[PDB]
Amino acid sequence: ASYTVKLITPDGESSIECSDDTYILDAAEEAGLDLPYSCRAGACSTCAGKITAGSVDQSDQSFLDDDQIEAGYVLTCVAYPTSDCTIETHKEEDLY
């Protein structure tokens, strides 16, 4: 886990690059620092984030980023290791 790549949410600048399975809650800050404590696997929608995927992710294994492969989209809790992460939680789709 290195946590450094481009990440930003209501908590503006955020650095994440787990390079070791999208960290659970950490990459979650990417998901939208919503701390998805509902399902953790794939049943709720607390893992938002405009594509928090990152990299290495597309086998329904790891639990964070990767709606299916480089697209956190909605099923972020379905990722693999993750050479790096990236979430457009930044902007808030409203201003910042």
Curated annotation (Swiss-Prot):
Details of cofactor binding: Binds 1 [2Fe-2S] cluster.
Annotated GO biological process: electron transport chain
GO molecular function, one term: metal ion binding
Top-level lineage group: Bacteria
Cross-referenced InterPro entries: 2Fe-2S_ferredoxin-like_sf, 2Fe-2S_ferredoxin-type, 2Fe2S_fd_BS, Beta-grasp_dom_sf, Fd_pln
Residues that coordinate or bind [2Fe-2S] cluster: C39, C44, C47, C77
Cofactor(s) the protein needs: [2Fe-2S] cluster
Disulfide links within the chain: C18-C85
Domain 2Fe-2S ferredoxin-type residues, every copy: 3-93
Gene3D superfamilies, per the entry: 3.10.20.30
Listed Pfam families: Fer2
Keyword GTP-binding among UniProt keywords: no
Keyword Glycoprotein in annotation: no
Keyword annotations: 2Fe-2S, Disulfide bond, Electron transport, Iron, Iron-sulfur, Metal-binding, Transport
Family designation: Belongs to the 2Fe2S plant-type ferredoxin family.
Subunit: Forms a complex with heterodimeric ferredoxin-thioredoxin reductase (FTR, ftrC) under reducing and oxidizing condition and thioredoxin. Interacts with a number of proteins including RpaA; binding to RpaA is higher when ferredoxin is reduced.
Function per UniProt: Ferredoxins are iron-sulfur proteins that transfer electrons in a wide variety of metabolic reactions.
Annotated NCBIfam families: fdx_plant
This protein's name: Ferredoxin-1
Encoding gene, per UniProt annotation: petF
